[PDB]
Design a protein around this ligand. Structure first.
Ligand SMILES: CC1=C(/C=C/C(C)=C/C=C/C(C)=C/CO)C(C)(C)CCC1
Length: 134
């Protein structure tokens, strides 16, 4: 296992604050809140089965999806829309991309360690998540 996804990473923040907002138009306060909100997260995979959750005040969210075994998730709590996903390891990565009105809500959570450059495409005008910690 040359990846060790299973990590912690007190989220720093996203770059295109506004483009990720659009990925699921919560509200205008949403993006400004998350902009500065340095939340916590921590994934953990065992092979073909992983899970992670965010730790914010504003909103609580989670992905909890397998690795390539397509699944119709939901964004309940946040916006309340229906979605689907798909994940495939891509080096030290695990290319996820949402569906169900999304079609461009994917990430490039490739792990470096102490630093991390999750790239939140999330619709046109790609955003760059900015992680750092574990
Ligand atoms: C906008 C927004 C949030 C961001 C959620 C995300 C984007 C969590 C990331 C999950 C992923 C991509 C895990 C893959 O390892 C949360 C709910 C947390 C706080 C307020 C609103």
């Amino acid at each position: 296992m040359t990846k060790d996804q299973n990590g912690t990473w007190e989220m720093e923040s996203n770059e295109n604050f506004e483009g990720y907002m659009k990925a699921l138009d919560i509200d205008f306060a949403t993006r400004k809140i998350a902009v500065r909100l340095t939340q916590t997260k921590i994934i953990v995979q065992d092979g073909d089965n992983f899970k992670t959750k965010t730790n914010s005040t504003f909103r609580n969210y989670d992905l909890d999806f397998t690795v390539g075994v397509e699944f119709d998730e939901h964004t309940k709590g946040l916006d309340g829309r229906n979605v689907k996903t798909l994940v495939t390891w891509e080096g030290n990565t695990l290319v996820c991309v949402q569906k169900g009105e999304k079609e461009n809500r994917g990430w490039k959570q490739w792990v470096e360690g102490d630093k991390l450059y999750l790239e939140l495409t999330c619709g046109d005008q790609v955003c760059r998540q900015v992680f750092k910690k574990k």
